[PDB]
Design a protein around this ligand. Structure first.
Ligand SMILES: Nc1ncnc2c1ncn2[C@@H]1O[C@H](COP(=O)(O)OP(=O)(O)OP(=O)(O)O)[C@@H](O)[C@H]1O
Ligand SMILES: Nc1ncnc2c1ncn2[C@@H]1O[C@H](COP(=O)(O)OP(=O)(O)OP(=O)(O)O)[C@@H](O)[C@H]1O
Ligand SMILES: Nc1ncnc2c1ncn2[C@@H]1O[C@H](COP(=O)(O)OP(=O)(O)OP(=O)(O)O)[C@@H](O)[C@H]1O
Ligand SMILES: Nc1ncnc2c1ncn2[C@@H]1O[C@H](COP(=O)(O)OP(=O)(O)OP(=O)(O)O)[C@@H](O)[C@H]1O
Ligand SMILES: [Mg+2]
Lengths: 51, 446, 57, 43, 38
C-alpha cells in the first residue's frame, strides 16, 4: 500500500503465495502481479508447485 | 479490452467458492481414498501472518496434570536419555524419560539426580580423600581439566568436609609423595544447603575465593559453586518444575512385568513425576491391571500408557485410567500403522477425553514435529535426532543450542500457518481453517 | 470440557465403523487393486493371553 | 521354532488365540487393516 | 621478557596469543584479570 501511494509509476509483484486465500489477500492490497512458489527451492509448510 | 474483476472485491469473491483451498484434516486422512499416510506424504498450507514469531506460545500438555513450555520429550533409550539428558530437557522447557535398561537401583539414582539438581551448582562434585598424594591430584587435574577438589574424610562426594585443595596449592609443590592433608586449606568457607545462586555468588565476591562448597547440618558435602560457572550467566526461564516442590520434572519408563511394580516403587520414592509404560502393543490385560494398580497405589503419579495406534486401543487404556497415551508402532512388520494415520485417528478420539498423546517415532526435523502436532499430538518424542548430543550417553553438539533451534523453528512454522499457539493450532485444524495438501512421490523429491 | 473417561468404551459405538479397513475394503480392485504383502499392515487388537497359548494348526 | 514363536506373537498382537480364530475374525470384520503408501514402507 | 604497559580486555587477548605474567613498564598476572566484570 505504501508503494502504490509513494511511487505512482512503479509496478509491484508480491509473494510468494501458494493458495487462493493468500492471492486474494495480496490482490486486495493492490498487487500488480503475484509470485507463486513455496518449498520447491522436508519442510513443514508449502505446496506442490503444479497444484 | 478484456474485462477483469475489480481488485477491491477480491476478498468478497472468496465466498463464491464452496470450500477453502486445499484439504481439511478429515479429507486428508481418509483411509478408503488415500490410505495410511506418514508425515512426508503431506504439507500444511500457509495462512496469514499478522504477528512476529517471538509471540508464538508452545505450551503443551504432557499428561492430564502436567503441562510443558515446549512439546519436546526425550526418548527412553539407553543411547538418548539418562540423568544428564533429563536435567537439560527439563531446564529447556521439555522433559526427559529415563530408560530402564539398567537396574532398578541405577534408574532410581538417575531420577534422584534429576529431582535434586540445582541450576548453577556443581551438583556432582569431584572429590579427593586426605590420604592421596599430590601426584594423584595432578593426575586428576589432567583427566578432568579442573583442580578445585574439596576433601572429605572418606574421600567420597557425600563425606564430611575437611578442607579444599586447588591448583594454586599444588602448582609449585616438591616431593610428589606428600599427602593432600599437608598442603590443603583446613579452614574452608562454605554455604548452608538451601542457599540460592545470588546469595552464593555474593559470598565469592566478598571472599574472592574460587569455590564455595555447600554442606548440610552434619557437615557433609552436598554441592559446590564455581565462580567461573556463574560468569557464563546461563538462565532457564522455561524450566519444567513440579507444582508442589518446584523441582525439575522427571519421567521414567518401565515394563509391565511383575518385577517392575517394585521398580516403580523405587522410582516414586526417588520423586518421579510421570511414568511411561513401555510396550510395543499396550492394549493388554497386563498393562491395564498395571494402570489401575498405579492410580490406586501412587496417588500423585501421572501415567502414560502405550504404545497404541488405533482408536480401540486408545479407548481401552483411557477407560483403565491413563493420564496420557504414547502413539506409534514400527515408525517388513506384520502389525503396525503409518504414523500420521495413527496419530490422527487416536488423537481425534483421545483429545475429546482430554488425554494428551505423545507422537513417538519417525521424527527427524522440525517438519515432522509440526505435522505431528497438526494431526492431533500434544507432544512429540525424539530419539535418534537427540542421540549423539553432548547430554546423551554423531557429535551433534549440546542440546542447549539444539532445543532452542527447534523451539525457534516451531515458532516460525506456526507463524507461516497463522496461529499464535499450539492450543490455537489445534482448534484451527479441527475447525477446518488450517488446510493440507497430499504429496505425490514426485512432489516429495521436488 | 472433556468427556468422562468412564464412557470411553461406550463411546466407541458412536462411530459407524471400527478404525481401519476390513479385508474386503482393503482388497478392492477398483480403488487400489494389485496389492502385495508389503503394501499393507494388520492393525493390533487386544491382548488377554500369553503368546505360548496360540495354536497354529 | 523361531518362525513358530514369531507367528504366535503376531497372533497375540492381533488378539487371536489360533489360526482358525484369526480366519473367523478377519472374515467378520473384527481384524482391521491399513494400506501403506510408499513413504510408509520406507519408514 | 615480554611486558605490557598501561586495558584488561587487551591483556586477555595477549594471553591467548602467547602466558599472562606481564610487567607494567609494575606487574599484572592472570589471577588479577580472571573474574573482572569491566
Ligand atoms: N570439583 C569439581 N567437580 C566438578 N566440576 C568442577 C569442579 N571444580 C571445577 N569444576 C568445573 O570446572 C570448570 C572450571 O571451573 P574452575 O575454573 O572454577 O575450576 P579451577 O579448578 O578453578 O581451574 P584453574 O586451575 O583454571 O583455576 C567449571 O565448568 C566448573 O564447573
Ligand atoms: N571456598 C573456599 N574457602 C576457603 N578457601 C578456599 C576456598 N576455595 C579455594 N580456597 C583456597 O584459597 C586459595 C584460592 O582458592 P582458588 O580456588 O581461588 O585458587 P585457583 O582458583 O585454584 O587459582 P585461579 O584463582 O588462578 O583459577 C587457594 O589456596 C585455595 O585452596
Ligand atoms: N506382567 C506380565 N505378566 C505376564 N506376561 C507379560 C507381562 N508383561 C508383558 N508380558 C508378555 O511378555 C511379552 C512382552 O511384553 P512387551 O510388554 O515386552 O511387549 P514387546 O515390548 O512388544 O515385546 P518385543 O519387544 O519382544 O516385541 C508379551 O508377550 C507380553 O504379553
Ligand atoms: N612474560 C613472559 N615472557 C616470556 N615467556 C613467558 C612469560 N610468562 C610466561 N612465559 C612462559 O611460560 C613459562 C612459565 O611461566 P608461568 O607458567 O610461570 O607464568 P603463566 O605461564 O603466566 O602461568 P598461568 O599461565 O598458569 O597463569 C615460562 O617459562 C615461559 O616459557
Ligand atoms: Mg579456579
Amino acid at each position: 500500500k505504501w508503494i502504490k501511494e509513494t511511487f505512482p509509476d512503479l509496478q509491484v509483484i508480491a509473494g510468494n503465495v501458494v493458495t487462493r486465500e493468500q492471492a486474494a489477500s495480496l490482490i486486495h492490497a493492490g498487487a500488480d502481479g503475484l509470485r507463486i512458489g513455496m518449498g520447491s527451492g522436508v519442510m513443514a509448510c508449502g505446496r506442490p508447485q503444479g497444484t | 479490452h478484456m474485462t477483469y474483476r475489480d481488485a477491491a472485491t477480491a476478498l468478497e469473491h472468496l465466498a463464491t467458492y464452496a470450500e477453502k483451498d486445499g484439504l481439511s484434516v478429515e479429507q486428508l486422512m481418509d483411509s478408503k481414498t488415500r490410505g495410511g499416510l506418514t508425515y512426508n506424504d503431506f504439507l500444511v498450507l500457509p495462512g496469514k501472518i499478522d504477528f512476529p514469531s517471538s509471540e508464538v506460545v508452545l505450551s503443551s500438555r504432557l499428561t492430564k496434570k502436567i503441562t510443558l513450555n515446549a512439546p519436546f520429550v526425550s526418548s527412553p533409550m539407553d543411547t538418548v536419555t539418562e540423568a544428564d539428558m533429563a536435567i537439560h530437557m527439563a531446564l529447556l522447557g521439555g522433559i526427559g524419560i529415563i530408560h530402564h535398561n539398567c537396574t532398578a537401583e541405577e534408574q532410581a539414582e538417575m531420577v534422584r539426580r534429576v529431582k535434586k539438581y540445582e541450576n548453577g551448582f556443581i551438583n556432582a562434585p569431584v572429590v579427593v580423600g586426605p590420604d592421596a598424594t599430590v601426584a594423584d591430584v595432578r593426575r586428576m587435574k589432567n583427566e578432568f581439566g579442573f583442580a578445585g577438589f574439596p576433601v572429605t574424610d572418606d574421600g567420597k562426594p557425600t563425606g564430611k568436609l575437611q578442607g579444599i585443595i586447588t591448583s594454586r596449592d599444588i602448582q609449585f609443590v616438591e616431593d610428589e609423595t606428600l599427602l593432600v592433608s599437608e598442603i590443603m586449606t583446613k579452614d574452608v568457607i562454605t554455604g548452608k544447603q538451601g542457599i540460592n545462586l545470588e546469595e552464593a555468588n555474593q559470598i565469592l565476591k566478598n571472599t574472592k575465593k574460587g569455590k564455595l562448597p555447600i554442606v548440610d547440618e552434619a557437615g557433609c558435602l552436598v554441592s559446590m559453586l564455581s565462580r567461573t560457572d556463574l560468569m557464563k550467566n546461563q538462565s532457564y526461564p522455561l524450566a519444567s518444575k513440579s507444582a508442589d516442590t518446584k523441582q525439575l520434572l522427571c519421567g521414567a519408563a518401565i515394563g509391565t512385568i511383575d518385577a517392575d511394580r517394585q521398580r516403580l516403587a523405587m522410582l516414586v520414592e526417588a520423586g518421579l513425576d510421570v511414568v511411561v509404560l513401555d510396550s510395543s502393543q499396550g492394549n493388554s490385560v497386563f498393562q491395564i491391571n498395571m494402570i489401575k494398580w498405579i492410580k490406586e497405589t501412587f496417588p500423585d503419579l501421572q501415567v502414560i500408557a502405550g504404545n497404541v495406534v488405533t482408536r480401540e486401543q486408545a479407548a481401552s487404556l483411557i477407560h483403565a485410567g491413563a493420564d496420557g497415551l504414547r502413539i506409534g508402532m514400527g515408525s517388513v512388520m506384520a502389525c503396525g500403522r503409518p504414523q500420521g494415520t495413527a496419530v490422527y485417528n487416536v488423537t481425534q478420539f483421545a483429545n475429546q477425553f482430554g488425554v494428551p498423546c505423545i507422537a513417538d517415532g519417525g521424527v527427524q526435523n522440525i517438519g515432522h514435529i509440526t505435522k505431528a502436532i497438526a494431526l492431533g499430538a500434544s507432544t512429540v518424542m525424539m530419539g535418534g535426532m537427540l542421540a549423539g548430543t553432548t547430554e546423551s550417553p554423531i557429535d551433534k553438539g549440546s542440546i542447549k543450542k539444539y532445543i532452542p533451534y527447534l523451539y525457534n523453528g516451531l515458532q516460525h512454522s506456526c507463524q507461516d500457518i497463522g496461529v499464535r499457539s499450539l492450543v490455537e493450532f489445534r482448534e484451527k485444524v479441527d475447525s477446518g481453517s488450517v488446510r493440507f495438501e497430499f504429496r505425490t512421490p514426485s512432489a516429495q523429491l521436488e
